[PDB]
């Protein structure tokens, strides 16, 4: 028996833990997955010297923990099998595909992660804010009020994630790309560092933030926190929240201890579900909210009708450019090169402090040193130059998020053929109109791996504004990217699998009124009608957004925690 | 200051840890890599509930901690860049490639793994014995003495790993293939289960063994071993052992803390290198031993001449089958079938204990139930049914190791497409004659990610019996696999990139006499000339072997440990 | 190349490949309809696809 | 060097070439349609024996060349189709459409 129980040890799971644990509460937290990250629980897996030296190898780790949400029944024709081999006469349901799934209105890319820390053990760490136009109202009819609230809550999230914008100032390649872009857009567009949840430590190590940054996930009391009380129980599939008859209260959490196998009922005052857009939705439907099964309007549920509807996922376009000759030459514009590299007459010099220099002394000193010390190498960019983290944020006139940078690179010859210093990644993130017809539902007969109803997608991108904007977005990535250089073959402008972006929201969305705003939680993140049941995560966000949701989910989480603090006494220690 | 220092925390470094920490010594172990396998330090990463319910997905974890040993300069012509993108006029050194490496005399598949637990945090766990023909001699002129000594070491080594031959005995697939191959070779070849470092926990969970199994890596003293003394220091790149001018002794170990940055000088009575076959060599070469640089039979080295010569790696052919129609019908050969699937009158029945049944009662009960509870499924094999683990061990009438099984493979297009249960993997491992001209050397110019001399390989498969055998092996896989099914399109008979198999041996090889057996360590695994320097790993094996080596490398390490407990005294508690 | 120039397939089943990376402004059917001449009588699994 | 090994197939009534009474091809004729699978039994056995033979035989001249590993080819690509208007002495007893004069 605890004051609060948290389902899920992700970054939002951990926002709720951080706030409540240090506010004197006794918190129990369960996660389906295990401690998967060394001695800092929930930590980013990319924080090891091996990876920061071999960053390309990291894409593999991501794919290791992205388990597909809904896979249609495969109908590929393999007809070169030996005549002695067994072949079915049908494409039967096999290797776990979901026979409810329409292969053509799916979010095939959608995946999930089961590991203490959630997808924060692997994430890229982009933590920007939403402007008014992507933002749910926390207050109605007082923009200034609303802005006050969001700034206060955002600033705390930024605090928790260790967000900053300075970690990459001393990269050449970063500065090359940011300056070129500013030049060009001549005050139509602000360019800047992607805000990133991380702290730098040497020129070659960054500590990427995570669930663990928010909250270190040690059992308490411990020596450093002898007054706090917290327990984390991994290897537990939470399955059901038990409803009172009045549908005013949750009375327990039914759990499955995957190690022992046995099941348990856990009692608490406050119930917080932070298990992710898909699984926050799945547990509530398994618990009698919403509607189990293929959705049926001639029989609409009376509890939380809007749940699992209005689901938004972002369109996502990608490509990679090989930096322009013009920009490589520009790097070395202050240098006075003579001789031919590798010969003994050869010298590169610059006049330090010179007011006619285009770059500062630090830059030029690196370019000189690299070129004199490595005459064999033909590019003026030093060897461990940090990589770019450029962005232009969402605006009315360009309603999409943009990251011009380097993440998860899976090397297929023409990306090892090209020198990686030349390569910059473009990803542009469109926004989607929340629409009732787009659903996440659960099968009343099919089950997934952990024995729960199988999730199923009825999603297509709304025609109209989302469709228009999404193709405008592509052409923009092509217009913008051309300025830094040509596409790198094997990474041509493309739209990515729907859902691969993993920015799903609106599955348990927020509003002021359940009915008029078609939603399941209030701006306190409480479920309508229920006194002690809160939801955390992107499931909450009701609006059309292009930017990365986590820092807004955490914002709403922090807001919810404050309701809790104002209405439930911690038990006495 | 310590009694013993171990470099590396692989299964073998742990073999030394377990014997020496147990015996009473004050032991320090370093690993360049960090703790990330969650709370059981160094445990096998496949031992989560998720990965055991998602085997397919583990391939990625393995991919992500195999950092290639030596990558040659890329000469792929990309002639489709935009004209505005920068491109050089030469194939210069880039993306960390190694200029010394002849691409055609390489072991391109070779890779190494820097994470506490070593490669044992991802290995398949096959732990067979070597028969006399692949084994090094431990007693001369006394083949029964030499048989006893090994039976004794291997029995001890099996204990440490929990090696077993019956963890899969209730797999329907395992026995179907095991039996079919037995019928087929009818007194020509013996088949049995792969021996496997693994403990079954539930019908659906195997607890795979690892370095963790051998030693729990938990600092000591603790509650459970309060009179023991052990410390594991991760993130520590050991750069060099230090010789006396006599070359009779090692005086200290120079280390480099990758968190602090700082370097130190550790002292110990005993030094044990278990940093791997590639890196045991590197360290040594970097510490005076053997030659540095492109090797040069003109100027030959005064210390351990033979180090980094007579290197062996196995030829590996691979392919997958789709189970035959006959074999699949046989699974359900005992059943009476009435009606047609999915009808209210559909029956599947067998008669328990009927003298004319072909399968035991347990197998039939599984078949019957599965056919009744999943009437939409066209196959008689139950879903959660463990995979085959079938082997016919190396004999001289078939001089290779064989694995008819299922192991982390990245199933592509025809391979989520063919039903998992129909699929079997085939891996045949050839034995390579040790030859002087086959080398692992180290650049005097280039350097790896850790500023150690860069590994460069000079390897080709000996002509003669290593090559004749290799092809007779490819042919054998074809002849034999043709008895379980045809080839899986997408996984056709093929030789794998050299070294991919990761069984490299003989880089620091054992023999009785240094010059006569052209070797680097005697049969206590102590380096010739040196009074306190020991070496463990597959690199110790000097012979031509096809079976998986780690159990034999352990076995030798136990023996080295006996020497240690018999010539060095623990300092006191 | 010349061979393939004059091997016109006898019976091509209705294609059911899933291309799901199309732009949201592009037309997509909600079915795998009979298109580019495939033979909707053809069982993709008891065909002689190679026959030409 | 190229290896191609060509198995033989038991003629079986159930394997058909038929034409659609509603669908039409490019030259406005009924659309051909296949109901073919390789007969289990002797054809299936022989066909996989054949593969293993190509592997045994080919090994003698040398190893496979990657991108051209032992494989079964698309059914029908071999273009050796027969029996569609087959021959016999008697239409009825030999199940056929032409005589040994090739007359219908
Ligand atoms: C995969 C990915 C993520 C991603 C990204 C990079 C990639 C490759 N880039 C991002 C970036 O630049 N910035 C950004 O804002 N987001 C980025 N993301 C996605 C980001 O990780 C998510 O937006 C966010 O992490 C979601 O966190 P949340 O706190 O909502 O939860 P979660 O991370 O999915 O983890 C919660 C967990 O709860 C568990 N679980 C699920 N079901 C159960 C049940 N039934 N019982 C108990 N526990 C449950 C999980 O195992 C889990 O870890
Ligand atoms: C990769 C792999 C391994 C493998 C396998 C399948 C895969 C994909 N299947 C096998 C099988 O089923 N059975 C078997 O016999 N072996 C199989 N293997 C290979 C096996 O894992 C290895 O042979 C075995 O792990 C070798 O043990 P050892 O302990 O000798 O070496 P290691 O595992 O490579 O670990 C050594 C480590 O020390 C480190 N290191 C490297 N440099 C340094 C320096 N400079 N200083 C300190 N430590 C260093 C590493 O970081 C490492 O972990």
The chains in contact with chain D, meaning 3 or more Cβ pairs closer than 8 Å, are A, B, C
Range of the domain at A375: 324-385
A89/C46 Cβ within 8 A: yes
Contact of B22 with B565, CB cutoff 8 Å:
no
Tokens of C24: 């949201």
- If asked whether residues B70 and B198 sit together in one domain, one would say yes
Decide whether any atom of ligand 1 lies within 6 Å of the A136 Cβ. no
Query: Rounded to the nearest 10 degrees, how much is the dihedral formed by the CA atoms of A76, A79, A83, A84?
Result: -30
Domain boundary among A385, A410, A430: A385
Round to whole Å and give the CA distance between A330 and A555: 42
D40 interfaces chain C, CB cutoff of 8 Å:
no
- If asked whether residues B335 and B450 sit together in one domain, one would say no
A115 is in an annotated binding site: yes
3-state secondary structure of A149: helix
Round to whole Å and give the CA distance between A401 and A423: 20
CATH number of the domain that A362 lies in?
Answer: 3.30.1920.50
Query: Rounded to the nearest 10 degrees, how much is the dihedral formed by the CA atoms of B436, B441, B445, B450?
Result: 180
- Report chain B's terminal Cα–Cα distance, integer Å: 15
Round to whole Å and give the CA distance between A215 and B445: 46
Round to whole Å and give the CA distance between B105 and B458: 5
Q: Tell me how far the alpha carbon of residue B117 lies from the centroid of ligand 2, in angstroms.
A: 8
Chains B and C touch (3+ CB pairs under 8 A): no
- If asked whether residues A213 and A136 sit together in one domain, one would say yes
A81/D47 Cβ within 8 A: no
Decide whether any atom of ligand 1 lies within 6 Å of the A538 Cβ. yes
- If asked whether residues B275 and B375 sit together in one domain, one would say no
List alpha helices for B196-287, DSSP H. 211-214, 277-285
- Phi, psi at residue B494, to the nearest 5°? -160, 150
B354-362 long-range Cβ contacts below 8 angstroms, 24+ apart: B358/B330, B358/B333, B358/B334, B359/B333, B359/B334, B362/B170
CA–chain centroid gap for D95, Å, is: 18
3-state secondary structure of B496: coil
Tokens of B490: 């997408």
Instruction: Give the DSSP letter of residue A120.
Output: G
Round to whole Å and give the CA distance between B503 and B539: 9
Round to whole Å and give the CA distance between A146 and B20: 66
Helix orientation angle between A143-161 and A550-565, rounded to the nearest 10 degrees: 100
A81/D44 Cβ within 8 A: no
**Residue showing tokens 């290779």:** B400
Domain boundary among A385, A405, A432: A385
Tokens of A227: 């007054």
* Model resolution, angstroms: 2.8
- Report chain C's terminal Cα–Cα distance, integer Å: 15
- If asked whether residues A282 and A359 sit together in one domain, one would say no
Contact of B20 with B561, CB cutoff 8 Å:
yes
The candidate with the shortest Cα–Cα distance to C50, out of D24, B320, A77, D13, is: A77
| Contacts (Cβ under 8 Å, ≥6 apart) of B487 | A82, B319, B320, B321, B322, B481, B493, D51, D70, D71, D72
**Number of structural domains chain A divides into:** 2
Domain boundary among A353, A385, A417: A385
The candidate with the shortest Cα–Cα distance to A218, out of A39, A6, A47, is: A39
Round to whole Å and give the CA distance between B74 and B98: 10
- If asked whether residues A365 and A469 sit together in one domain, one would say no
Please count the other Cβ atoms lying within 10 Å of the Cβ belonging to residue B417. Answer: 19
The candidate with the shortest Cα–Cα distance to A318, out of A211, A203, A409, is: A409
Q: With a CB-CB cutoff of 8 Å, which residues 46-85 of chain D face chain B?
A: 48-49, 51-52, 55-56, 59, 63-64, 66, 69-72
B490 interfaces chain D, CB cutoff of 8 Å:
no
Length of chain B: 573
- If asked whether residues A319 and A330 sit together in one domain, one would say no
Round to whole Å and give the CA distance between B317 and A113: 34
| Contacts (Cβ under 8 Å, ≥6 apart) of B462 | B432, B433, B435, B438
- Phi, psi at residue A207, to the nearest 5°? -95, 95
D43 Cα to chain C: minimum distance (Å): 16
Count of alpha carbons within 13 angstroms of residue A480, beta-carbon side: 33
Q: B330, exposed or middle or buried, with CB in 10 Å at 0-12, 13-18, 19+?
A: middle
| Contacts (Cβ under 8 Å, ≥6 apart) of A225 | A21, A218
Q: Does residue B221 have a cis peptide bond before it, meaning omega lies within 30 degrees of 0?
A: yes
Q: Which of A79, A80, A82 sits opposite D47 (nearest CB)?
A: A82
List alpha helices for A483-521, DSSP H. none
Query: Rounded to the nearest 10 degrees, how much is the dihedral formed by the CA atoms of A142, A148, A151, A152?
Result: -130
D38 interfaces chain A, CB cutoff of 8 Å:
yes
| Contacts (Cβ under 8 Å, ≥6 apart) of D4 | none
- If asked whether residues A181 and A319 sit together in one domain, one would say yes
Q: Ramachandran region of residue A42, left (φ > 0), alpha (ψ -120 to 50) or beta?
A: left
- Phi, psi at residue A228, to the nearest 5°? -85, 155
Tokens of B149: 């000594």
C37/D76 Cβ within 8 A: no
A557-560 long-range Cβ contacts below 8 angstroms, 24+ apart: A557/A12, A557/A15, A557/A16, A557/A19, A557/A274, A557/A525, A558/A15, A558/A19, A558/A153, A558/A156, A558/A157, A559/A138, A559/A149, A559/A153, A559/A523, A559/A524, A559/A525, A560/A16, A560/A272, A560/A524, A560/A525, A560/A526, A560/A534, A560/A536
Q: Which of D59, D66, D72 sits opposite B486 (nearest CB)?
A: D72
Across the B:D interface, residue pairs with CB atoms under 8 Å apart total: 44
Q: Residue B64: nearest ligand to its CA?
A: 2
Residues with CB under 6 A from ligand 2: B 7-13, 30-33, 62, 113-115, 118-120, 122-127, 237-238, 274-276, 279, 283, 502, 537-538, 548-550, 553
- If asked whether residues B137 and B284 sit together in one domain, one would say yes
The candidate with the shortest Cα–Cα distance to A310, out of A501, A545, A556, A555, is: A545
3-state secondary structure of A63: helix
Round to whole Å and give the CA distance between B182 and B142: 34
The candidate with the shortest Cα–Cα distance to B552, out of B15, B29, B190, is: B15
Round to whole Å and give the CA distance between B485 and A83: 9
- If asked whether residues A269 and A350 sit together in one domain, one would say no
Tokens of B95: 């993306």
Round to whole Å and give the CA distance between B537 and B9: 11
Count of alpha carbons within 13 angstroms of residue A465, beta-carbon side: 11
Decide whether any atom of ligand 1 lies within 6 Å of the A284 Cβ. no
Count of alpha carbons within 13 angstroms of residue B248, beta-carbon side: 1
Q: 3-state SS of C1-52?
A: CHHHHCCCCCCCCCCCCCCCCCCCCCCCCCCCCCCCCCCCCCCCCCCCCCCC
Please count the other Cβ atoms lying within 10 Å of the Cβ belonging to residue A468. Answer: 13
A48/B34 Cβ within 8 A: yes
Round to whole Å and give the CA distance between D94 and A370: 86
- If asked whether residues B128 and B49 sit together in one domain, one would say yes
Round to whole Å and give the CA distance between B176 and B388: 9
3-state secondary structure of B317: strand
Round to whole Å and give the CA distance between A232 and A116: 9
3-state secondary structure of A269: strand
A79 Cα to chain C: minimum distance (Å): 7
Contact of A250 with A241, CB cutoff 8 Å:
yes
Query: Rounded to the nearest 10 degrees, how much is the dihedral formed by the CA atoms of B165, B170, B176, B181?
Result: 10
> Which residue from B minimizes the CA distance to A424?
B85
> Which residue from D minimizes the CA distance to A81?
D72
- If asked whether residues A290 and A362 sit together in one domain, one would say no
The chains in contact with chain B, meaning 3 or more Cβ pairs closer than 8 Å, are A, D
Round to whole Å and give the CA distance between D33 and D84: 12
Contact of B273 with B534, CB cutoff 8 Å:
yes
A487 interfaces chain B, CB cutoff of 8 Å:
yes
User: Which residues of chain C lie closer than 8 angstroms to A90, CB-CB?
Assistant: 45
Q: Of the residues B275, B405, B541, which should be mutated to test ligand 2's pocket, given the most ligand atoms within 8 Å of the CB?
A: B275
Contact of B136 with B54, CB cutoff 8 Å:
no
């Amino acid at each position: 028996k605890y004051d609060v129980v948290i389902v899920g040890s992700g970054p939002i799971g951990c926002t709720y833990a951080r706030e409540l644990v240090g506010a004197g509460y006794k918190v129990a937290m369960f996660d389906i997955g295990e401690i998967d990250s060394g001695l800092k629980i929930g930590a980013h897996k990319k924080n090891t010297v091996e990876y920061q030296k071999n960053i390309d190898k990291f894409v593999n780790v991501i794919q290791g923990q992205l388990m597909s949400v809904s896979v249609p029944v495969n109908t590929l024709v393999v007809d070169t099998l030996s005549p002695t081999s067994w072949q079915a006469s049908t494409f039967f349901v096999r290797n776990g595909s979901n026979p409810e799934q329409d292969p053509l209105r799916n979010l095939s890319g959608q995946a999930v992660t089961r590991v203490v820390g959630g997808m924060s053990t692997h994430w890229t760490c982009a933590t920007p804010r939403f402007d008014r136009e992507q933002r749910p109202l926390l207050v109605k009819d007082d923009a200034d009020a609303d802005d006050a609230e969001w700034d206060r809550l955002y600033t705390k999230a930024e605090s928790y994630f260790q967000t900053g914008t300075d970690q990459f100032k001393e990269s050449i390649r970063h500065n090359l790309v940011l300056n070129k872009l500013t030049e060009e857009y001549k005050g139509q567009r602000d360019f800047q560092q992607i805000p990133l949840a991380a702290t730098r430590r040497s020129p070659t190590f960054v500590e990427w933030s995570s669930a663990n940054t928010v909250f270190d996930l040690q059992n308490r009391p411990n020596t450093d926190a002898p007054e706090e009380r917290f327990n984390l129980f991994p290897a537990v599939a939470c399955e059901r929240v038990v409803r009172n008859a009045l549908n005013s209260e949750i009375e327990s959490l039914h759990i499955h201890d995957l190690i022992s196998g046995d099941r348990f009922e856990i009692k608490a005052d406050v119930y917080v579900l932070t298990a992710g857009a898909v699984h926050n939705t799945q547990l509530l439907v398994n618990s009698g909210f919403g509607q189990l099964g293929r959705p049926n309007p001639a029989n609409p549920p009376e509890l939380l009708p809007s749940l699992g509807s209005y689901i938004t996922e972002q369109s996502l376009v990608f490509c990679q450019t090989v930096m322009s000759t013009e920009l490589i030459d520009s790097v070395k514009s202050d240098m006075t090169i003579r001789g031919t590299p590798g010969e003994l007459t050869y010298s590169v010099t610059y006049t330090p402090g010179a007011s006619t220099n285009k770059h500062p002394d630090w830059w030029n000193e690196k370019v000189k040193n690299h070129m004199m010390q490595h005459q064999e190498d033909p590019l003026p960019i030093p060897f461990e130059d940090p990589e770019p983290q450029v962005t232009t944020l969402f605006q009315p006139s360009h309603p999409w998020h943009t990251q011009i940078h380097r993440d998860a690179a899976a090397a297929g010859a023409v990306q090892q053929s090209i020198d990686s210093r030349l390569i910059v990644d473009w990803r542009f993130f469109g926004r989607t109109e929340p629409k009732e017809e787009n659903k996440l539902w659960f099968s009343d007969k099919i089950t997934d791996a952990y024995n729960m109803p199988q999730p199923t997608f009825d999603f297509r991108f709304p025609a109209g504004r989302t469709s228009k904007e999404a193709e405008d977005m592509m052409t923009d990535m092509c217009v913008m990217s051309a300025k830094i250089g040509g596409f790198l073959p094997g990474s041509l402008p493309q739209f990515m699998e729907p859902g691969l972006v993993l920015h799903l929201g609106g599955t348990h969305r927020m509003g002021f009124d359940e009915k008029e705003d078609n939603c399941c939680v209030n701006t306190d993140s409480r479920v309508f009608g229920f006194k002690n049941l809160f939801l955390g995560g992107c499931g909450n966000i009701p609006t059309a957004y292009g930017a990365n949701p986590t820092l807004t989910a955490m914002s709403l989480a922090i807001k919810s925690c404050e309701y809790i603090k104002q209405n439930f006494t911690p038990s006495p220690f």
